[PDB]
């Protein structure tokens, strides 16, 4: 298995870990803030996914400093992870095309 594919897999497992810890930590950070909605684990997990993918419907979001800091980590982990898959796909195509060109 080439590096890029290995890194892709690793990036994926790591994202899953960030999502779960992010969901757990968001609840921990947000409970105690009057008005917060990111306070139960099931929807927090959903919030973590739509944040990692940067969709951000706006149905749920953190209102506290630490909830927001946790959100930033999730955003960056998602962007980085998917960005890394793109780079792996590019490498795959670059390699295949170099062969097809007989180089």
């Amino acid at each position, epitope marked *: 298995s080439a590096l890029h594919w290995r890194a892709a897999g690793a990036a994926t497992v790591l994202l899953v870990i960030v999502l779960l810890a992010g969901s*757990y930590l968001a*609840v921990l950070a947000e*409970r105690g803030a009057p008005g*917060a*909605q990111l*306070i*139960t*684990y099931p929807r927090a997990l959903w919030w973590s996914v739509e944040t990692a993918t940067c969709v951000g419907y706006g149905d749920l979001y953190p209102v506290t400093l630490w909830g927001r800091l946790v959100a930033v980590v999730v955003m960056v982990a998602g962007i980085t992870s998917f960005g890394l898959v793109t780079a792996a796909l590019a490498t795959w195509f670059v390699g295949r095309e170099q062969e097809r060109r007989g180089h």
Partner: antibody
Amino acid sequence: QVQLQQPGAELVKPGASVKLSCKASGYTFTSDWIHWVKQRPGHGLEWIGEIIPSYGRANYNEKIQKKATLTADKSSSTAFMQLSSLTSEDSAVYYCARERGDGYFAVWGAGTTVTVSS
Amino acid sequence: DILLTQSPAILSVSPGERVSFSCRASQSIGTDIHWYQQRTNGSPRLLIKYASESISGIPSRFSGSGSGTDFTLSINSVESEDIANYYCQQSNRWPFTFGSGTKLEIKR
């Protein structure tokens, strides 16, 4: 089997403090929160606060005067609530309840009747 | 903080009739409402979670409905054992809050 065990009663002198206990059994998850609810005779249910034993973080009802301090003991699976400097206004049944982090109180304790008197 | 209004405070019904308890939230809370039954000198007991989802061990005559700001707890054919106080509770926003409760009376 009873998931939450609470002592039946506690007599407290005005001004004094008491530490109520809530021993939990059954399934325990890192996502569990133990809540405390106050119910005065003839009145409804009033939320006091909550605590997540897996982390030790506690939040309290901001609308009422803070009389409690929540702690938890992971090894003995027990949650505690320290009520301090009580008055007759603190006389009531205090229930502990378990929430799986999904918003509802699936199980409640039998409740401890606290009487503040001389 | 979300205010939960339970009115009327007391509901009288004849044995066997269908009864409905009202719970109105001060703002929209989706379906994050839960219902509890508390009999005289007993501790609260979960009846319905998330507005309409049934709980195991709870008689089938118990059901809930509604979304947004208005919710209903219904009992199909009330019987003596249903005599108690009924409370709604919200978990949409922090902090969780409880309604004032409605008592069920049966006119036998």
